[PDB]
Symmetry: C3
Subunit: 225 residues, 3 copies
C-alpha cells in the first residue's frame, strides 16, 4: 500500500478539487495537513490552466478544526505571525475563486476554512459553528453575514444547521446529503465557462473594497478597465 496523503488534489479541466482526507482524525488539520493545503492552493493560484477550486473533506465530513491531539508533537499546527495561517491557506488572497463543499461538520478552524472560500455549498444535514479564532473567523464572519448574526455565532459557539445557514446567507446553496462535492464541482465548472478576466476582476474589487471609503473603492473598481 501507498503512504497516506492527508490532502488529495483532483483536476477536471479548469476545476481543481482539494480534498482533506484524514478518516481517523475526522479531517482535522494538523501541521503537515495545513502545509499541504497551502501548497495545493499555491499551485492552484499559479496554474493558468486552473480557473476555479473546490475545497472539500472526504469521509462524509468537512473539517473538525485544528488537530488538538497533535499539540506538543512534531505534527502540531504551526502558529506564527508570518507565513501561512495555522489551518494552512487561511491568510491567502487568491487571484481566483474557491467553493467550499461541506458535508458533516465544519467547525472551529474548519468553519474558518469555509469562510475563507468565496462560496459555500452545504449538505442538508451539515453543521457549522464556532464550538481562539486565528484563521480569520472574527474578520470574515461579520463581513459575510452582518455583525449581529456574526456576534451570535462567535459568542455562543452554537451549531448552525443547513436551513439556518441558508436563511442567514452563510450557506449559498443547500443540496441533498452526500452531494455537496458534486454540486460544488458543477458550480465551479459553470463559473469556469464564463468570461474569466471580467469575473476575476469583479471578485477582486468586491474583496478589496472592505475597509475602504466609497470614493477609494470606486477608484479601485474602475481599474477593472
Amino acid at each position: 500500500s501507498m503512504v497516506s496523503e492527508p490532502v488529495r488534489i483532483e483536476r477536471n479541466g479548469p476545476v481543481t478539487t482539494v480534498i482533506i482526507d484524514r478518516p481517523e482524525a475526522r479531517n482535522a488539520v494538523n501541521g503537515p495537513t495545513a502545509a499541504a493545503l497551502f501548497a495545493a492552493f499555491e499551485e492552484f493560484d499559479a496554474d493558468d490552466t486552473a480557473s476555479v477550486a473546490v475545497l472539500t473533506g472526504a469521509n462524509g465530513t468537512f473539517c473538525a478544526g485544528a488537530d488538538l491531539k497533535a499539540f506538543g508533537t512534531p505534527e502540531a499546527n504551526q502558529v506564527h505571525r508570518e507565513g501561512p495561517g495555522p489551518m494552512g491557506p487561511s491568510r491567502m488572497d487568491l487571484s481566483k475563486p474557491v467553493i467550499a463543499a461541506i458535508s458533516g461538520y465544519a467547525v472551529a478552524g474548519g468553519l474558518e476554512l469555509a469562510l475563507w472560500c468565496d462560496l459555500r455549498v452545504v449538505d442538508e444535514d451539515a453543521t457549522m459553528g464556532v464550538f481562539p479564532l486565528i484563521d480569520g473567523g472574527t474578520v470574515r464572519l461579520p463581513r459575510l453575514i452582518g455583525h449581529s448574526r456574526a456576534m451570535d455565532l462567535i459568542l455562543t459557539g452554537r451549531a448552525v444547521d443547513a436551513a439556518e445557514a441558508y436563511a442567514i446567507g452563510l450557506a449559498n446553496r443547500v443540496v441533498p446529503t452526500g452531494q455537496a462535492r458534486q454540486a460544488a464541482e458543477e458550480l465551479a465548472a459553470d463559473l469556469a465557462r464564463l468570461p474569466q478576466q471580467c469575473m476575476r476582476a469583479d471578485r477582486l474589487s468586491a474583496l478589496h473594497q472592505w475597509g475602504e471609503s466609497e470614493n477609494a473603492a470606486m477608484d479601485f473598481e474602475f481599474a477593472s478597465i
Copy 2:
C-alpha cells in the same frame, strides 16, 4: 420620447428612462441626461425625494452595448460622471428605485446606487454583464457587499444569476415588493411619505449612515455626532 423624462409632483421628482427599442439601456446621451436630472434635483431646494424608474415595463438593461464604437457610446473616464450617468454621485437627498421588468448589469448598479428599491413581483435583478464579459464599473462591486453582505454579494457577482422578487426581498436587496405594474406608484407614495418628515434630520441621518462605511467605530461615531450641528 427624449431618453430621460422628469416629472414632478410637489417635492417628489420622478426621473424616467424611456428608450423602448433599447429596453431602457443607457448610452452616452442617456447617461448625460440622467446625470443632469440628478444634478438639478440635488440643487433644487423645492425637491425632497427622487424616484428613478424606467418606462415600457422595464427598468434598465444596462449600458448600451450596441452603441460601443459610435458617437453615442457610454463615456468611460476615471474623472466626472460614471458610465451609467449618476452612479458616482453622492446626493444630499434620497432616491428610490422603482423597478419593473429587468434591472440588470449597469441597470442593477443604478438600483444599488439608490437608497431604497421598490420592486414589482415579476421583476428580475442580476449581474447579467457576467455572461457578456463587461465589468462592473458603476459601483456594483462596492455597493452590493455593503447592501446585502459579502456572502450573497459574491454569489450574485460571480454567477451573474437572476434574482426574482421573492429572493430579492428575502435577502434585503428589494426593500418593498408590490404587484406587477405598481412599482412606480408605490415608490412615489413612499417618496411622499419621506418628504412629509422633518427633512434636515432625516438627511443628516442618511448621510451619516452612508459616510460610516469604511470607517472605524470611533471615527464614524464622531461624524454622526456632527448631525447635532445640522
Copy 3:
C-alpha cells in the same frame, strides 16, 4: 431610575422610569454610564443584561426634560447622550427587550452585542417623526448589524419593526414569549458566562475591531488573540 441586580457573573442593568416609559434623561444616562463602568471594571462580572422595567425597554431620550437641569447631556467628549452608547466594553451585554425600543432606546439595543426580544415588542427609529437626530450610534451600527439596504429603510422611514420581522432580518437574535425577554437574556448570559472567558472575549473584540479595517490589518489584530 437605574437599578442593578447581580446573579453570580451576570449583571442586570434595569431602566426604571414608569411615568416616562423608561425614557432616558441626564441623570438616567449618567446612572447607566456608571453601571456599565462598574461592570467593565468588575472581574467577577462576566456578562451584562440591559433591560427596562414596567413592560417596556426604552422610549428614547427624555424630550420633556429639554431645557431643564435633568436634560440629556449632549457633548462631543465623554458619555453619549443616552449614557453608555459610546463605550467600548471589554465584555458582552445582551439587550432584553419588552414593549418599545425606539429612537435612542433602539440605539441602546444596537449598542448591545445581542438582542433578545418579546414576541410583542416593537423596534424603530421613531425619532424620525419627531425630527431628533440619531447621535448614539444608530447610523453607525445599524448598517453594520443588518446591512445597508435594510438599515436605510428603517433609518429613512422611521417605521415600526415587530419581533418576527426583527428576527427575519437579523436585528433580533432571539424571540421569546411576552414577558420573558429578561429571563431568557439572563439564561443566555449565564450560558455565555460558563464558556472559556478569555477566548470568547478576545474573539468578540476582534470581530468588533475589524470594522473599517482592511483584511490584512484585521487579520493582524486577530492574530494578537493568541
